[PDB]
Structure 1
């Protein structure tokens, strides 16, 4: 059996996570099991780097007025 964290999101973010897995942008293949087109299963020891990558992707194409 597999123990970790279930992540639910839109298919675009799921595919972004898949690309991160295949490109080894986090340094390893920790994105192990894919269950649904909109749900994935990720080991919980590196949820922080995934959050940082998601935030960087989100605010990259944002053009903050600050």
Structure 2
């Protein structure tokens, strides 16, 4: 899988995005820690676009 290190506040934004995504039931593969999460390699580029919104 893919390991991404993110802020806990960013992880909550990712968790809401995970519920929002309809391509897959969940967008977050695993939650080892708030700092370390497993992310599907599809909307990582979209997340960079979402940085302005966030």
Calculate the TM-score normalised by the size of structure 1: 0.58
Q: 1:49 to 1:26 in 2, by over 3 A?
A: farther
State the Cα RMSD in Å: 2.4
Point out which structure has higher relative CO (alpha carbons under 8 A, 6+ apart): 2
Q: 1:53 to 1:25 in 2, by over 3 A?
A: farther
Runs of 4+ displaced beyond 6 Å: none
In structure 1, C-alpha distance between the alignment counterparts of 2:43 and 2:19, rounded to whole Å: 16
Larger-Rg structure: 1
| SS across alignment from 1:53 | helix
Partner residue, 1:9: 6
How many residue pairs get aligned? The number is 53
CA apart distance, 1:53: 1.4
Alignment gaps of 5+ in structure 1: 57-66
Q: State whether residues 20 and 26 of structure 1, in contact with CA within 8 Å, keep that contact through their aligned partners in structure 2.
A: no
